[PDB]
């Protein structure tokens, strides 16, 4: 099955009106090192909730 008429750029945009991405609302700050990280994740230096976990 295939189309009988060619769709328009207006219709293309209307369909694409649901494709926008979402950004992270905010980041968290560790209590000993001051780094920024994703909530419930460890930091790039190896801290979580004030304690060094990974050397």
């Amino acid at each position: 099955a295939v189309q009988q008429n060619k769709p328009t750029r207006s219709k293309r945009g209307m369909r694409r009106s649901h494709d926008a991405l979402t950004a992270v609302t905010s980041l968290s700050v560790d209590k000993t090192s001051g780094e920024k990280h994703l909530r419930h994740h460890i930091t790039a230096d190896g801290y979580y909730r004030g304690r060094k976990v990974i050397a």
């Binding site: 494709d19 992270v24 980041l27 920024k36």
Partner: protein
């Protein structure tokens, strides 16, 4: 004062790069870097490199201050396409397009 940076002939589709470009339009540079660091897309790496280059140009060639800069313009345009061949069943051949784009970032202190 305004400062430009560009990446020409980048290996990606403009439709795919515009999704990431729409996230940082009109933001402060620090906020924009924080937004780009936590987006799980391939276009984010390219856009981040271009933004960093623009900040460096503004510091070195114009004597600007980092804490006053904002992303005043950003856009993506289509480049040339490469043409390739892919075989199908019963001896029929198809065409493949490999698309590219140009990326422009403008930072300003006003």
């Amino acid at each position: 004062m305004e400062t430009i940076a560009k990446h020409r002939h980048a290996r990606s589709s403009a439709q795919k790069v515009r999704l990431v470009a729409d996230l940082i339009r009109g933001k402060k540079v620090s906020q924009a870097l924080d937004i780009l660091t936590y987006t799980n897309k391939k276009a984010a790496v390219l856009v981040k490199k271009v933004l960093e280059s623009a900040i460096a140009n503004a510091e070195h060639n114009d004597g600007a201050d980092i804490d006053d800069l904002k992303v005043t313009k950003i856009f993506v345009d289509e480049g040339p396409s490469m043409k390739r061949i892919m075989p199908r069943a019963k001896g029929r051949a198809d065409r493949i397009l490999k698309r590219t784009s140009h990326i422009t970032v403008v930072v300003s202190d006003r």
